[PDB]
């Protein structure tokens, strides 16, 4: 259970950075799209996999840009980051059910 706590701590350490920088990333630029993938989406996937593993939760989080209908790349990035956080809440609800 210690490992799971360690995963939550890493996730929240990552999130504090991702949540502020996401507002500055232009998702429509080549570099911004790549940085979002490398530094936001990819770590999120690893955290979500580590969170779900010990509880049998096997889900694959995927970005949904169709739900971010904005011309401004900065607002797309903030919208996609919101999806990441929502997925965290979804997995946590599943875990709490398992534990209960």
């Amino acid at each position: 259970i210690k490992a799971f706590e360690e995963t939550l701590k890493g996730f929240e350490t990552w999130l504090k950075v991702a949540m502020q920088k996401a507002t500055l990333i232009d998702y429509n630029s080549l570099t911004g799209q790549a940085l979002f993938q490398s530094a936001i989406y990819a770590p999120a996937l690893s955290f979500f996999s580590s969170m779900g593993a010990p509880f049998g939760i096997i889900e694959t989080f995927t970005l949904a840009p169709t739900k971010c209908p904005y011309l401004d790349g900065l607002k797309i990035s903030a919208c996609l980051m919101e999806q990441v956080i929502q997925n965290y809440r979804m997995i946590v609800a599943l875990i709490q059910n398992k534990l209960s």
Binding site: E6, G10, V17, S29, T31, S38, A42
Partner: protein
Amino acid sequence: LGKKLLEAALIGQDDEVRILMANGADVNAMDNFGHTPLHLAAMMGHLEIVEVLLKTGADVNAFDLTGFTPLHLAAYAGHLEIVEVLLKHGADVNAQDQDGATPFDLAAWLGNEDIAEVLQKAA
């Protein structure tokens, strides 16, 4: 052991990193995005794990599939002490992603002014 090292280096499990290295984990292990453990620890700010990876032969200038180096990702996240350690171990300040962005560029665009000044000095 590579996937366990990538996970422990991202999460910040110092003990587990040391155990994995002592059991012969590949310091060059790569995730599905081209990241090495050092990419993930530098981005996260995990200093001691960064030092452990460097001491065990990590390429300080490895590129992930999106063209970012560990210096890029530390400059992005705002980890000044990491940036300084990477530079001391030969990190390339002129590394560019696939559209020409350097570590300085990322620091400037993302508002990490201290790092941007350090990288400009080094250039």
